[PDB]
């Protein structure tokens, strides 16, 4: 079980993948003519990330895979496990993960069962609350998912080129801070990210091209956003908060 105590393990040289299934089965709920409620599925995705390298394997889940199926929320866990196991089989042996960490414990059985052929790959849950559900708030990721007309894998580096300048530990911290802000107040977070138009996003990147000094500013702005939202939610005057209290709230996980 992965937790705040064995966190550095994420950045060692043993290949590992996080798998988050939150956005696999996505629906809009609406009323029918007779006044009953019905769901309409929209495209989803499995978010599979190597936290050391930033390589993201985004498997797009096209709505056609739900056609004529029952118990979709259950099915979605098994579909996720089928696709993760297919991805593992597709990788050369030296690229296969030694561990797969699932963000939600309900994924453990489905994945364990689909991975029986790989007895040496550890499947683990985590005590960390990770903000990966917010991946669909990244515009280019949302775009590719919504445009897909058939099942499709797309590969990204979710750290852009940050690893040229910072460590994986720092890159993951930056990523989870950004995603935590996007999850907490998407509109505000995007405004912080996309306000100064002189700072653009390269065609081959997901995030803007901030300098080292600008990332420091961006990051404190995101921390302030998270704190401000925390105070708005619980009706607390964040003025009184201490530096220690502040850090915990920011970390979420």
């Amino acid at each position: 079980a992965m937790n705040s105590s064995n966190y550095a393990e994420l950045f060692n040289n043993d290949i590992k993948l996080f798998v988050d299934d939150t956005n696999v089965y996505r629906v809009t709920v609406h009323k029918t003519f007779e006044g009953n409620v019905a769901t309409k599925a929209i495209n989803g995705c499995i978010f599979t990330l190597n936290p050391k390298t930033g390589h993201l394997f985004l498997k797009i889940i096209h709505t056609s895979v739900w056609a004529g199926q029952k118990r979709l929320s259950q099915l979605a866990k098994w579909k996720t496990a089928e696709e993760v196991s297919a991805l593992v089989r597709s990788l050369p042996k030296e690229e296969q993960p030694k561990q797969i960490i699932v963000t939600r414990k309900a994924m453990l059985d489905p994945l364990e069962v689909h991975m029986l052929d790989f007895p040496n790959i550890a499947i683990r849950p985590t005590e960390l609350r990770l903000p990966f559900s917010a991946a669909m708030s990244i515009d280019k990721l949302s775009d590719v998912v919504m445009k897909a007309t058939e099942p499709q894998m797309v590969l990204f580096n979710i750290y852009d080129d940050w690893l040229d300048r910072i460590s994986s530990y720092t890159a993951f911290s930056r990523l989870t801070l950004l995603l935590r802000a996007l999850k907490t107040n998407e509109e505000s977070a995007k405004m912080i990210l996309l306000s100064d138009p002189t700072i653009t996003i390269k065609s081959y990147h997901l995030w803007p091209s901030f300098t080292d000094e600008q990332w420091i500013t961006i990051e404190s702005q995101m921390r302030d956003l998270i704190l401000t939202e925390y105070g708005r939610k619980y009706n607390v005057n964040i003025s009184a908060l201490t530096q220690t209290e502040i850090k915990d709230i920011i970390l979420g996980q």
Binding site: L75, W78, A81, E82, D109, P110, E112, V113, H114, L116, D117
Partner: protein, 300 residues
């Protein structure tokens, strides 16, 4: 109407014979048990008064030979042996009977309990689970581990029960992962019944044997096996009707016979709640559910 004589009773001991038991004093003039009903396997078991960790016994069938018990002061236990001299055996037995130094296996003809607990249990199957080919009877005790237990998963000192593992390649067909994990019918019907047990009678026989070893010896691996075999049936959407009906009867008599005091050590809450209330077969076990609810409500 067969007899298992005892040479003597040199140490104080509680002796069980099937579901019955009685205490014998150190050096009490006790020379065995007579009137043992022919046609069923039986188990004679022991718990020493001075050391309750000494908990062990022998499964046997008198149709298969003349057996007796003799205490071994070196190994410190009552041992079963076979007497090959028929004439010598009948003469010992006659003399012990004439002197009325034997307990009678308690009758009461209206009672089918033992038959109901051992209906499918056969000595030849027992001998494949407990491997000691030189003897016609089988020793079991409270500490023997099962082949499945061993690690994470003397040969005669392990219980070779059939391994059941819900997350194994054996249980799950490639391409049917979700189907097979959520509905164990393939694993039950094709792998276990057709493939390994050959028939439901053999399956029930191992289930019954596992329960009895758990109850009489407090053998933990046996309790694991008993629960696994129940769960596999209840977790299958497709089971022949005659098997579900028989299972209800089997479990009814097992729950009926269990000491209400050992309910907490012998019954797995998670498994029973799933089996009676959530499983595919939650409405197929009417008798069992009724006795459980009335006898062990604090369990569910």
């Amino acid at each position: 109407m067969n007899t298992v004589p005892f040479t003597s009773a040199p140490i104080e001991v509680t002796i069980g014979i099937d579901q019955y038991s009685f205490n014998v004093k150190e050096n009490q003039p006790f020379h065995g048990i007579k009137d043992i009903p022919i046609g069923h396997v039986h188990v004679i078991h022991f718990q020493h008064a001075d050391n309750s960790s000494m908990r062990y016994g022998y499964w046997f069938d008198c149709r298969m030979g003349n057996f007796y018990i003799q205490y071994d002061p070196k190994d410190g236990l009552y041992k079963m042996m076979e007497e090959r001299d028929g004439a010598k055996f009948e003469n010992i037995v006659h003399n012990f009977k004439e002197r009325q130094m034997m307990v009678s296996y308690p009758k009461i003809d209206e009672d089918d309990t033992w038959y109901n607990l051992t209906e499918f249990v056969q000595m030849d199957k027992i001998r494949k689970i407990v491997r000691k080919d030189e003897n016609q009877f089988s020793y079991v005790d409270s500490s023997m581990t099962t082949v499945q237990e061993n690690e994470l998963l003397d040969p005669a000192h392990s219980l070779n029960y059939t391994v059941i593992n819900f997350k194994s390649r054996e249980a799950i067909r490639p391409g049917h992962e979700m189907e097979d994990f959520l509905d164990k019918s393939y694993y039950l019907n094709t792998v276990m019944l057709q493939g390994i047990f050959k028939n439901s009678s053999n399956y029930f026989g191992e289930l019954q044997f596992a329960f009895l070893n758990a109850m009489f010896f407090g053998n933990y691996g046996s309790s694991l096996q008993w629960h696994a075999m129940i769960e596999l049936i209840c977790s299958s959407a497709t089971v022949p009707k005659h098997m579900l009906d028989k299972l209800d009867e089997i479990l009814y008599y097992q729950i009926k016979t269990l000491p209400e005091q050992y309910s907490d050590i012998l019954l797995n809450e998670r498994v029973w709640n799933i089996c009676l209330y959530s499983s595919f077969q939650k409405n197929s076990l009417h008798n069992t559910e009724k006795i459980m609810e009335n006898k062990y409500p604090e369990l569910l």
